[PDB]
Scaffold this active site. Structure first.
Site, mmCIF file in Angstrom:
data_model
loop_
_atom_site.group_PDB
_atom_site.id
_atom_site.type_symbol
_atom_site.label_atom_id
_atom_site.label_comp_id
_atom_site.label_asym_id
_atom_site.label_seq_id
_atom_site.Cartn_x
_atom_site.Cartn_y
_atom_site.Cartn_z
ATOM 1 N N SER A 248 0.864 -1.198 0.000
ATOM 2 C CA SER A 248 0.000 0.000 0.000
ATOM 3 C C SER A 248 0.892 1.238 0.000
ATOM 4 C CB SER A 248 -0.976 -0.089 1.168
ATOM 5 O OG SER A 248 -2.069 0.819 1.022
ATOM 6 N N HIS B 153 -7.296 -5.251 -2.173
ATOM 7 C CA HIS B 153 -6.048 -4.637 -1.734
ATOM 8 C C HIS B 153 -5.510 -5.323 -0.483
ATOM 9 C CE1 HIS B 153 -3.058 -1.505 -1.538
ATOM 10 N NE2 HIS B 153 -3.481 -1.082 -0.359
ATOM 11 N N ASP C 178 -8.017 -4.291 -7.139
ATOM 12 C CA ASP C 178 -7.372 -3.243 -6.346
ATOM 13 C C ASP C 178 -7.214 -1.937 -7.123
ATOM 14 O OD1 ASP C 178 -5.888 -1.788 -4.500
ATOM 15 O OD2 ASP C 178 -4.128 -3.075 -4.580
#
Ligand SMILES: *[C@@H]1O[C@H](CO)[C@@H](O[C@@H]2O[C@H](CO)[C@@H](O)[C@H](O)[C@H]2NC(C)=O)[C@H](O)[C@H]1NC(C)=O
Length: 277
Positions: A144, A254, A201
């Site tokens: 991330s 994600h 994602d």
């Protein structure tokens, strides 16, 4: 900047190393103060930071990955915020390492700032544990926001640390720098660079290309999300990749399963569980 039209090819990456790296970075979302915690084949050696202000960084020793640096990716700021905000502005490389980058390199302010708050501690700890473990390999991992920080760290290690980089594993990687940066990543660590995208994602689509940001070459896209079906999409911004399937603007994929290891983040598994899914 261009966009690759190369057809997808099979995934050639070591899925056991991806599974391990996923667990090593999931653990940075967890309290990591336990002496000698074992994640997969690796032993936790050191931890810095917490989650507010600075990202947690865990240092491990791994027989397969060497000294592994993993960087948490919590929402210090939000990537779904106003894009005119200074966090998303392009800026020169920091004075610590600008001498190593080609003219015209630009990086996202919010990500460079986050790395700059960590780099000197990371360098000091990595050098210490390389000496104490007789280890030449350094692997950098992120997820991330942490994947963008880890990409900058991986380049910094290749450029500035004796012995350079072994591998970098990056999960749900945002764009970090401009066209010049992206091509310099390919030139310096292209054979060491592993970017993994799960499912629908949305994070690898921000910040947008319209702001001057460009990914480095290649990523492996797991589709459907959480499955073991995955292909490699070669070159920068491959036109056959993730935009062919509508992104979902939540964090489910994600924070999904990457070759049998969940990176659920703050509401994930603590301690991390390599290969449990
Ligand atoms: C892949 O697995 C992740 C979990 O790692 C799933 O994410 C969950 O999605 C549900 C909604 O269906 C949410 O309520 C949960 O909070 C999510 N968990 C986490 C940890 O974020 C995801 O939906 C899965 N994707 C697919 C396509 O099956």
């Amino acid at each position: 900047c261009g966009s690759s039209t190369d057809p997808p090819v099979p995934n050639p990456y070591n899925t056991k190393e991806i599974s391990l790296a996923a667990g090593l970075v999931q653990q940075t979302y967890c309290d990591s103060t336990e002496n000698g915690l074992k994640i997969g084949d690796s032993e936790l050696l050191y931890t810095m930071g917490e989650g507010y202000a600075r990202q947690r960084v865990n240092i491990y020793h791994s027989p397969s990955l060497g000294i592994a640096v993993a960087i948490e990716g919590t929402n210090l700021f939000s990537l779904n915020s106003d894009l005119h905000d200074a966090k998303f502005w392009q800026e020169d490389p920091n004075e610590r390492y600008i001498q190593y980058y080609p003219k015209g390199t630009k990086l996202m302010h919010g990500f460079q700032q986050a790395y700059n708050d960590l780099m000197d501690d990371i360098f000091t700890a990595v050098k210490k544990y390389k000496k104490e473990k007789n280890e030449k390999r350094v692997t950098v991992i992120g997820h991330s926001l942490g994947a963008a920080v880890a990409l900058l760290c991986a380049m910094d290690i290749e450029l500035r640390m004796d012995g350079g980089l072994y591998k970098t594993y990056l999960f749900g990687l945002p764009r970090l720098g401009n066209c010049t940066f992206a091509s310099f990543v390919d030139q310096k660590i292209g054979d060491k660079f592993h970017s993994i995208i799960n499912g629908r994602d949305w994070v690898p689509t921000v910040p947008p290309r319209a702001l001057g940001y460009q990914h480095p070459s290649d990523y492996v896209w797991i589709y459907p999300g959480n499955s073991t079906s995955a292909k490699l999409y070669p070159g920068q911004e491959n036109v056959h990749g993730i935009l062919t399937v509508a992104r979902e603007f939540n964090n489910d994929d994600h924070q999904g399963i990457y070759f049998h290891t969940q990176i659920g983040a703050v509401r994930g598994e603590c301690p991390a569980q390599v290969g449990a899914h």
